[PDB]
């Protein structure tokens, strides 16, 4: 199925996923598409930050669901 990942810079990534796929997995697909190491990828969906150990269906991600790639910003 298709999911969408939106970056803070406003770039949209399509991903090809299974409901069973890990978060570790989704992240390496990001690394393939975008180059960002999994280490620096912070994913959020429906109010929750997606943690490595778990899978997609855990967080109730569906087809056409949108994730967001986020960041801490220094300076204020």
């Amino acid at each position: 199925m298709q999911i969408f990942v939106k970056t803070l810079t406003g770039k949209t990534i399509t991903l090809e996923v299974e409901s069973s796929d890990t978060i570790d997995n989704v992240k390496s697909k990001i690394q393939d598409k975008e180059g960002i190491p999994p280490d620096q990828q912070r994913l959020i969906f429906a109010g929750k930050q997606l943690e490595d150990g778990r899978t997609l269906s855990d967080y109730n991600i569906q087809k056409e669901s949108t994730l967001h790639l986020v960041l801490r910003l220094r300076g204020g």
């Binding site: 406003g10 959020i44 109010g47 801490r72 204020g76």
Partner: protein, 1001 residues
């Protein structure tokens, strides 16, 4: 004077020059000046529009002060507009601020470019004003706030053009190939980063010449390293070279009127965990206007059961009439709509700040066409901010006005809760942009007022001119004064309840200030709030908060981007539990020999500057003063010594000598060194295949011919001469004046420039992965420190924001000359200043919003919330616009001997300065742990592998003395606490991760 860079500096890196030129010509009208209106107004005036006009003939009442930071108790009875105008007028001398007295007229109204309707304007009147604006071509924005709820609505007219949807630097990349069918392959490994439907122009594509026209091409993405642009057969055949540059193209968009949007709304969500609420609140907010009409302009009363039921009926009727709005079969969310009724009179600083920051940015978008407008409706709520009913019961008695500036806050939270806020003891670390916004929120909260509470703010920085633009508690006359002191003063002016209640300190927070910020200091506090602008200091504080077990409020911004984070003792991960992406490392060889971006030549210019005027002087003064400097160097070797002999036999005697030096350096770095590189790797050399060596990232450079009339050649010599003068303490001829061209020219015109002789044996490396990266001659040709007693070189301390010191002048010129070498577009001094000085773009707009979200998280701390799902980490980009939240991550849990513990927050506590042998035994007779290793900081105190010599000398010692011994010189002095780290084997003999130790002295 098109755009004062010393004022709009940081903001200028967020918005363009062009967009600020467009803002500089817009007139804004804000309707209503309660909390929400004055926030928007503050942020818009600071940004610098053509003019700000303000409409609020309503008389100032006590309760308005709940979020209106520009009103005082004295102003009561006066017109809100009249009283705010003067205060707003003080924010930005460039922006006139007027009061409008009535609204019946058209000739005034039609002169404004943007009109903002605020919480004081009814929905009926909103529909009418929007109608006039829409049909007039006047941009319209409205926003209202009601307790923990809010909305914004944007109508930018039938025709609006976005010039740049994101504010992101255009993508760029090197071309390896373009095939006849228009497929562009990237240079091995380089990502294009493009997206389908982006547009791109081309440079330096040898073979398809008219392709380099400036003509744009629609991009179809094939993979990370390749994209298609359609057939190029008709331009010719690709040969070599090539640079793509993304170009943002105008997009015309169309907005609907408020009247239309009311029955068919288009949403942008504030919180994806809460998407089903938008439709609900859209109906809700319409209902509380139907309520007002029915009850003579009055909102539902606070926590009133009857009025809530009425509101639920109004929303229900809406959904019966339009089943589409909630959705077929979808029920009315009665507990949500109830809450909207309960809180309709509430006026919450956190919510106002959020809507003010974000509405203000929409205003700026509407003036410039820069960034993507909010497409029409957004709803927000922060219901998780409500305290637990069992401890702070919310009812009609609890929640009633008591004749106080806080009673629209009491309206939501109850007196007892509001009182507990007043009694908080907090630490604010930093008093910049977030600091000022924070203190401001706190003033309105009444936070730290009341006998048991208080505020401590520290910041060692003084107020700089470039800061006024986003640090709105400071005035041009305050520059040079201390940030925290001025901010405390300014905030007590807003709310006198904080007199004698804010302790404004001027100290940094790190290893060196632990005496002033001792255990007694930290233990006292309820929570800590970061208002910092670098990571090291954020990390230091995060460490202290976990040691002392205090909640920490974190937030940061970069341009339109912002984030918020909560750290809760024994509950969450801390700041440090997580790392952000590092600064992208530039390959040494790319800097050294093969630049191809202006970032490359700046970095090179910046280290050159540090070489010339910092490390040279330091090394010489170290050589001259210290006895054994030379040998220590032996034990980064050859260059060190050369810096000390050039620097000592090349001494200038006057400014003339400094001009010569700089002009000769010009010939070294931009002519001779380039010619050596070309000697090393001739222009025509071919690697594998038949591919040129000079292709891809390797641009073949061309040596410079000095030309005084060239801006970069000239300024390299000027800046260079003056800085060398400065090292050697020589009166510059520019020191008094503008650089005299005819002077520099006469000197240079009379110099022998020695010609280039290539070195046949010196090899320059190509990759970092490549081998390889006369001595005594350099040594005893150093002329004995005795020949130069009492002589010093004066080292330069890079100061980026002082335009008269030649620093940026030098870096800009030096970078641009090397850029000329390698055919890179030269940069202006403001762009160099940004990159070399690592300046972070900032705007008041994102700062208010981010501070707002922090304060909504603050309420949760006051209720000592235990449930992690109540807390919200915030992520924001106002350019898009985007808002997102994530529940914080739980602290990692460990286990030893079937005993669970928190890996961040758990510790073993130990009373008195225990002997080392007692420590080990205590850990065996109480915890089933044998100590493998014991350490205090980076010092090793005990280890099971130690000999019986060291064992029995140390086993008997108290921790104090044990640290005296291991540390060549140590005696604590004022310390009452010691952290010790431990390695232990468990009850079964295997090695285990284990909490740290705290020794209480």
């Amino acid at each position: 004077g098109e755009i004062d860079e010393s004022l709009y500096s940081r903001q200028l890196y967020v918005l363009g020059k062009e967009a600020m030129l467009k803002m500089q010509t817009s007139n804004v009208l804000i309707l209503g000046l309660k909390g929400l209106g004055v926030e928007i107004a503050k942020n818009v005036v600071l940004a610098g529009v053509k003019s700000m006009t303000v409409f609020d003939p309503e008389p100032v009442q006590l309760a308005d002060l709940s979020t209106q930071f520009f009103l005082t108790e004295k102003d009561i009875g006066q017109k809100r507009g009249d009283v705010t105008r003067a205060k707003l007028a003080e924010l930005n001398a460039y922006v006139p601020v007027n009061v409008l007295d009535s609204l019946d007229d058209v000739t005034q109204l039609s002169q404004f470019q943007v009109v903002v309707a605020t919480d004081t304007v009814s929905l009926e009147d909103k529909v009418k004003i929007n109608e006039f604006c829409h049909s007039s071509g006047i941009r319209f924005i409205s926003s209202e706030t009601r307790g923990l709820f809010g909305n914004t609505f944007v109508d930018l007219g039938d025709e609006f053009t976005v010039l740049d949807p994101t504010g992101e630097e255009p993508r760029t990349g090197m071309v390896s190939d373009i095939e006849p069918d228009g497929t562009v392959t990237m240079l091995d490994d380089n990502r294009h980063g493009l997206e389908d439907g982006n547009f791109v122009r081309f440079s330096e594509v040898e073979g398809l010449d008219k392709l380099n026209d400036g003509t744009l091409f629609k991009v179809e993405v094939l993979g990370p390293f390749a994209f298609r642009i359609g057939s190029v057969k008709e331009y010719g055949e690709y040969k070599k070279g090539g640079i793509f540059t993304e170009v943002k193209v105008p997009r015309k968009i169309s907005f609907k009127s408020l009247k239309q949007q009311l029955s068919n709304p288009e949403f942008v969500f504030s919180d994806f965990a809460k998407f089903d609420r938008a439709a609900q609140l859209h109906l809700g907010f319409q209902a509380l206007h139907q309520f007002a009409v029915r009850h003579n302009g009055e909102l539902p009363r606070t926590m009133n059961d009857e009025d809530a039921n009425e509101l639920i009926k109004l929303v229900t009727d809406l959904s019966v009439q339009q089943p589409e709005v909630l959705g077929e079969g979808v029920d009315v969310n009665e507990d949500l709509i109830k809450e909207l009724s309960y809180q309709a009179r509430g006026d919450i600083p956190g919510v106002v700040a959020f809507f003010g920051g974000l509405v203000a940015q929409e205003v700026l978008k509407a003036c410039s066409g820069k960034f993507t407008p909010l497409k029409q409706f957004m709803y927000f709520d922060s219901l998780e901010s409500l305290p637990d009913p069992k401890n702070f019961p919310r009812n009609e008695k609890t929640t009633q006005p008591v004749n106080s500036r806080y009673d629209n806050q009491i309206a939501v939270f109850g007196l007892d809760f509001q009182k507990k806020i007043a009694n908080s003891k907090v630490f604010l670390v930093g008093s910049g942009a977030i600091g000022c916004e924070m203190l401001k929120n706190w003033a309105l909260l009444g936070l730290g007022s009341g006998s048991d509470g208080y505020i401590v703010v520290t910041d060692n920085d003084s107020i700089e001119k470039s800061n006024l633009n986003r640090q709105f508690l400071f005035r041009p006359k305050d520059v040079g004064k201390n940030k925290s002191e001025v901010a405390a003063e300014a905030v007590c002016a807003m709310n006198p309840d904080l007199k004698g209640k804010i302790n404004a300190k001027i100290d940094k927070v790190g290893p060196e200030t632990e005496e002033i910020f001792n255990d007694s200091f930290w233990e006292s506090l309820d929570f800590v709030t970061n208002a910092l602008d670098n990571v090291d200091a954020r990390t230091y504080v995060d460490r202290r908060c976990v040691f002392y077990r205090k909640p920490l409020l974190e937030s940061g911004t970069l341009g339109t981007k912002g984030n918020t984070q909560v750290i809760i003792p024994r509950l969450t991960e801390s700041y440090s539990s997580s790392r952000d992406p590092p600064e992208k490392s530039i390959p040494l060889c790319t800097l050294r020999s093969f630049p191809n971006k202006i970032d490359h030549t700046i970095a090179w210019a910046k280290s050159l500057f540090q070489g010339y005027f910092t490390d040279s002087a330091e090394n010489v003064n170290m050589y001259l003063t210290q006895p054994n400097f030379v040998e220590q160097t032996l034990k980064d070797v050859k260059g060190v010594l050369e810096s000390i002999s050039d620097s000592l036999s090349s001494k200038p005697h006057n400014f003339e000598d400094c001009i010569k030096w700089a002009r000769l350096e010009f010939e070294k770095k931009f002519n001779h060194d380039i010619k050596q590189l070309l000697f090393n790797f001739p222009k025509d050399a071919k690697t594998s295949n038949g591919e040129p060596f000079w292709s891809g990232a390797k641009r073949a450079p061309t040596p410079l011919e000095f030309d005084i009339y060239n801006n970069d050649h000239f300024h390299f010599v000027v800046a260079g001469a003056s800085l060398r003068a400065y090292n050697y303490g020589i009166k510059s001829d520019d020191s008094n004046s503008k650089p005299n061209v005819d002077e520099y020219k006469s000197v240079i015109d009379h110099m022998i420039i020695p010609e280039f002789t290539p070195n046949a044996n010196l090899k320059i490396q190509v990759n970092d992965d490549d081998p390889d990266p006369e001595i005594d001659q350099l040594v005893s040709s150093l002329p004995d420190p005795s020949t130069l007693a009492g002589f010093k070189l004066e080292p330069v301390d890079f100061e980026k924001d002082d335009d008269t010191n030649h620093h940026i002048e030098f870096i800009t010129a030096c970078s641009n000359c090397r850029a000329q070498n390698y055919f890179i577009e030269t940069a202006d001094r403001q762009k160099t200043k940004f990159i070399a000085g690592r300046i972070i773009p900032a705007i008041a707009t994102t700062t208010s919003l981010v501070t707002g979200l922090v304060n909504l998280e603050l309420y949760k701390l006051i209720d000592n919330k235990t449930d992690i799902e109540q807390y919200k980490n915030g992520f924001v980009n106002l350019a898009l616009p985007f808002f997102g939240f994530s529940e914080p991550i739980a602290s990692p849990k460990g286990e030893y001997n079937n005993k669970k513990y928190d890996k961040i927050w758990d510790r073993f506590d130990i009373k008195g300065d225990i002997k080392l042998s007692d420590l080990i035994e205590h850990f065996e007779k109480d915890e089933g742990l044998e100590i493998t290793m014991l350490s205090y900081g980076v010092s090793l105190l005990y280890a099971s592998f130690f000999p019986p010599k060291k064992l029995k000398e140390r086993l008997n010692l108290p921790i104090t003395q044990l640290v005296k011994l291991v540390t060549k010189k140590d005696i604590p002095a004022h310390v009452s606490t010691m952290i010790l780290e431990i390695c232990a084997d468990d009850k079964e003999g295997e090695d285990v991760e284990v909490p740290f130790i705290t020794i209480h002295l």
